[PDB]
């Protein structure tokens, strides 16, 4: 009943920089029910504010929360990468028991990375069981886009592969991928020359790696 | 101080009961100065809490309106644990499912945090039955002289459902490692990959052992990754 609207959905800045986090009640709030809470990849949601301006224990003074009525907010200064979170506000009231916002992502900006680039041919493991996996290692790049292009002896490939992307790294901020091309193993004895192409707006041209099936 | 250990199957049929078990260690499930919650998180619904037990001299419940006829949270003082029994579940009870502790600070004048969250259990609401993982190497290939890093790794193939853990070294090498998110296959199986940077030198030395771990098969796998 108690709807909780966070603004903006997604924010970007440096470290340094300073970030306010909204949050908008569809009706008011009792100032000692609104809480915050900041969740980093693959971690729990942690407690971050509670009773709207009171910081739980042990966390920095960098992180403020103000606001009454409907509207809230979580400020954090001196932004750090660590700080990569999404970030919630929550209420209560005896209505619409406990609700949550739909969180604010804070991404980290940091100066462009061009990716390192690696390319792993099949195991002979996985070769007897009839199917062979390509893998291409892009590690720790900046910013998020990146284009792969999978080549068999020339031949730009098309709908069989596909990649997955870390989350920003806590530490350095930056991005790793992994793409994998699946072929049989019949089409994979058919061909020589295996070659992964990366583009990234850190690399002045193209960077590919390559390797020969046998060698 | 205060351990939230939960446990309860990862995989649940269509209309089955989906039961979790949070047990604690450090407080009391008959505290009369906390509470004892249910939250579970999925990429489309967001945070949702779904009811909370708790003690004054006698037991009480309460449940989200919209789950108020499937749930039952049951607390249990000689285990010191309390569970979930969540009825006719569907694809959308698909979530990460979290045992919270709610707390009052300066009570009476305080309101309600969630300040202490257990590390939290995917469960997938899914017909098909579990299958293991194929663990195959990542081998360092011609990288012993190549710029003084290494890249290798471990890929884990066709299982079935989320989630695998893997660990480098027992746990003992963990700086550099990237273990990405899983992708679903068109036959309906998870693939995913870690991989981890090492020094060229240490190739010949040490030895690298990537431990993959599916708990809803029972599988375990120690696989060794050496250069080619």
């Known amino acids: 009943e108690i709807v909780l609207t966070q603004s903006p959905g997604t924010l970007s800045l440096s470290p340094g920089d300073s970030a306010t986090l909204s949050c908008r009640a569809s009706?008011?709030?009792?100032?000692?029910?609104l809480a915050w809470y900041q969740q980093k990849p693959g971690q729990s949601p942690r407690l971050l504010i509670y009773a709207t301006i009171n910081r739980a224990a042990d966390i920095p003074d960098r992180f403020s929360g103000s606001g009454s009525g409907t509207d809230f907010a979580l400020t954090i200064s001196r932004l750090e990468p660590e700080d990569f979170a999404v970030y919630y506000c929550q209420q209560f009231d005896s209505s619409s028991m406990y609700t949550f916002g739909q969180g604010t992502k804070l991404e980290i900006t940091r100066t462009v990375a061009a990716p390192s680039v690696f390319i792993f041919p099949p195991s002979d493991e996985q070769l007897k069981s009839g199917t062979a996996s390509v893998v291409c290692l892009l590690n720790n790049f900046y910013p998020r886009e990146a284009k792969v292009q999978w080549k068999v002896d020339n031949a730009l490939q098309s709908g069989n592969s596909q990649e997955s992307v870390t989350e920003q790294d806590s530490k350095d901020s930056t991005y790793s991928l992994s793409s994998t091309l699946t072929l049989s193993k019949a089409d994979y004895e058919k061909h020589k020359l295996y070659a992964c192409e990366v583009t990234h707006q850190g690399l002045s041209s193209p960077v590919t790696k390559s390797f020969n099936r046998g060698e | 101080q205060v351990q939230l250990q939960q446990s309860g199957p990862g995989l649940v049929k269509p209309s089955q009961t989906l039961s979790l078990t949070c047990a604690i260690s450090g407080d009391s499930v008959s505290s009369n100065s906390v509470a004892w919650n249910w939250i579970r998180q999925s990429p489309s619904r967001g945070l949702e809490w779904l009811g909370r037990?708790?003690?004054?001299?006698?037991?009480?419940?309460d449940y989200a309106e919209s789950l108020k006829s499937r749930m039952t949270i049951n607390p249990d003082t000689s285990k010191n644990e309390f569970s979930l029994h969540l009825k006719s579940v569907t694809s959308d009870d698909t979530a990460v499912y979290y045992c919270?502790?709610?707390?009052?600070?300066?009570?009476?004048?305080?309101?309600?945090?969630?300040?202490?969250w257990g590390r939290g259990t995917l469960v997938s609401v899914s017909s098909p039955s579990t299958k293991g993982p194929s663990v195959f190497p990542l081998a360092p290939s011609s990288k012993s002289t190549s710029g003084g890093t290494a890249a290798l790794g471990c890929l884990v193939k066709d299982y079935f459902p989320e989630p695998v853990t893997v660990s480098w070294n027992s746990g003992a090498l963990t700086s550099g490692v990237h273990t990405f998110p899983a992708v679903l296959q068109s036959s309906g199986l998870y693939s995913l990959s870690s991989v981890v940077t090492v020094p060229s030198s240490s190739l010949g030395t040490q030895t690298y052992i990537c431990n993959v771990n599916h708990k809803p098969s029972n599988t375990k796998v120690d696989k060794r990754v050496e250069p080619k």
């Open positions: 919270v502790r709610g707390i009052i600070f300066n009570w009476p004048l305080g309101g309600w945090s969630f300040d202490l």
């Open positions: 037990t708790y003690f004054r001299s006698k037991w009480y419940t």
């Open positions: 009706q008011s709030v009792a100032s000692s029910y």
